């Protein structure tokens, strides 16, 4: 007589979660931002995903982009509305090195242009793993000699996001922050794993500092 609908894997994971945010200012040629895509830089979504060993899902991407006026000396700063470009560069593709780089032509790379004041941009991504499922944990190495990189980072080859101001700089600098939100959809999960107990320490491995199993009480009969 009580349904378990809200404890489904879908309902548990199909909620948008911030995975990273980056900043960039319009006052330099290096005024762009980059982020190597990964789900291990935030505690909450990482812990939710790491309840399982293997996952297979589609992804909904939503960006929240906000700007702030930086100090300036010009009288009467009056800036038009700002337009932003976010470009996805799959591994092996050319990467931008400056705001006015030729790589922003995005002839084949998927890119999104969005103007401030509108609804947040949003796009969908399919399951893009070379394997049959995403891996949350990998007890192995990248090299056949068992030297070098050990762990889950060997399987992270998902590419890089690049972000920049489209508008040319005006009479005052503008600093913008882009917040990236991941929402898994059509999720399939396998091999449940104990929830993470020790606090996370690093992005690329499972390193931890030992912590007690629970909080304590005075005696075995204390209520």
């Amino acid at each position: 007589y009580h349904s378990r609908s809200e404890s489904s894997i879908e309902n548990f994971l199909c909620r948008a979660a911030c995975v990273y945010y980056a900043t960039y200012t319009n006052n330099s040629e290096k005024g762009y931002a980059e982020w190597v895509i990964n789900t291990r830089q935030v505690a909450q979504l990482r812990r939710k995903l790491e309840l399982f060993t293997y996952l297979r899902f589609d992804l909904e991407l939503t960006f929240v982009i906000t700007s702030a006026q930086q100090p300036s000396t010009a009288t009467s700063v009056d800036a038009p509305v700002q337009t932003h470009q976010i470009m996805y560069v799959p591994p092996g593709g050319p990467v931008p090195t400056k705001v006015t780089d030729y790589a922003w032509q995005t002839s084949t790379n998927p890119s999104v242009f969005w103007t401030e004041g509108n609804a947040p941009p949003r796009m969908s991504i399919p399951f893009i793993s070379i394997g049959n499922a995403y891996s949350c944990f990998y007890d192995g190495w990248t090299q056949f000699s068992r030297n070098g990189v050990y762990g889950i980072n060997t399987l992270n080859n998902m590419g890089t996001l690049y972000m920049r101001h489209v508008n040319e700089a005006g009479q005052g600098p503008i600093k913008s922050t882009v917040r990236i939100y991941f929402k898994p959809k059509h999720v399939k999960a396998w091999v449940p794993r104990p929830p993470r107990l020790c606090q996370y320490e690093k992005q690329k491995n499972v390193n931890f500092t030992p912590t007690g199993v629970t909080t304590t009480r005075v005696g075995i009969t204390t209520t």
Partner: peptide, 17 residues
């Protein structure tokens, strides 16, 4: 509407509920 897919890709569909 009630349920109509607007896109040609399955990844575009809403969640499985």
């Amino acid at each position: 509407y009630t349920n109509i897919n607007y896109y040609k890709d399955a990844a575009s569909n809403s969640a499985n509920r």
